[PDB]
Amino acid sequence: VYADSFVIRGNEVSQIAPGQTGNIADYNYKLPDDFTGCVIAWNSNKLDS
Amino acid sequence: QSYGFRPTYGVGHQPYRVVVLSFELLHAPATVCGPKKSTNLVKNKCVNF
Amino acid sequence: RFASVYAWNRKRISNCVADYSVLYNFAPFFAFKCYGVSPTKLNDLCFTN
Questions:
Q1: What is the DSSP string of C7-48?
Q2: How far is A1 from chain C (nearest CA, A)?
Q3: What residues in A contact C40, CB-CB < 8 Å?
Q4: What are the start and end residues of every segment in region (Integrin-binding motif) (chain A)?
Q5: Separation between Cα atoms, residue A46 and residue A48, nearest integer Å
Q6: How far apart are CA C5 and CA C3, in angstroms?
Q7: Which chains are within 8 Å of C by 3+ CB pairs?
Q8: Looking at chain B, which subunits does it touch, using at least 3 CB pairs closer than 8 Å as the criterion?
């Protein structure tokens, strides 16, 4: 089991998914089409501001 | 480029914190297992394993 | 001065070269659900109107 940790813009949160391109998913981070696991995203504006 | 995050911006522009968990559910020796208690072995009998 | 729901203003789009990747900074975009034409594969298509 692996965990990967990072912070992004909220508008691009939906872009972390198989078969999705754009800006973050083409030059920064990519997921496989047959990925199995979970994702967990939550607001962090309280601290990183 | 930058990720200038300020409380002035609304939803979508606020930073979002994400963490992804990737699993390895495939036929291989086990390394991580849940909290269950094992029992004894019985043989030569119609049982469920 | 966006109009009300009962009197919705129709705007026609004519001959142009539309780049559907720069509008992302114009609004918070609480939701961006899209129908049969996927938003990802929206740059590589030609439409009648």
A1: SPPP----S----TTSGGGSS--S-----SS-SGGGTT----
A2: 30
A3: 19-22
A4: 9-11
A5: 6
A6: 7
A7: A, B
A8: A, C
CA distance B33 to B23: 12
Residue C20 buriedness (CB in 10 A; 0-12 / 13-18 / 19+): exposed
Q: Which of B5, B8, B9, B13 to mutate to test the interface with C (most CBs of C within 10 A)?
A: B13
Q: Taking every pair of C-alpha atoms in chain C, what is the biggest distance, in angstroms? A: 34
Cβ-Cβ contacts under 8 Å, C26 against chain B? none
- Resolution of this entry, Å: 3.5
Burial of B13 (0-12, 13-18, 19+ CB in 10 A): buried
The Cα B16–Cα A16 span in angstroms is 12
Method of elucidation = cryo-EM
Asked if the C-beta of B49 comes within 8 angstroms of chain A's C-beta atoms, the answer is: no
Rounded Cα–Cα distance for residues A23 and A11 (Å): 12
Structure tokens at B3: 């990720």
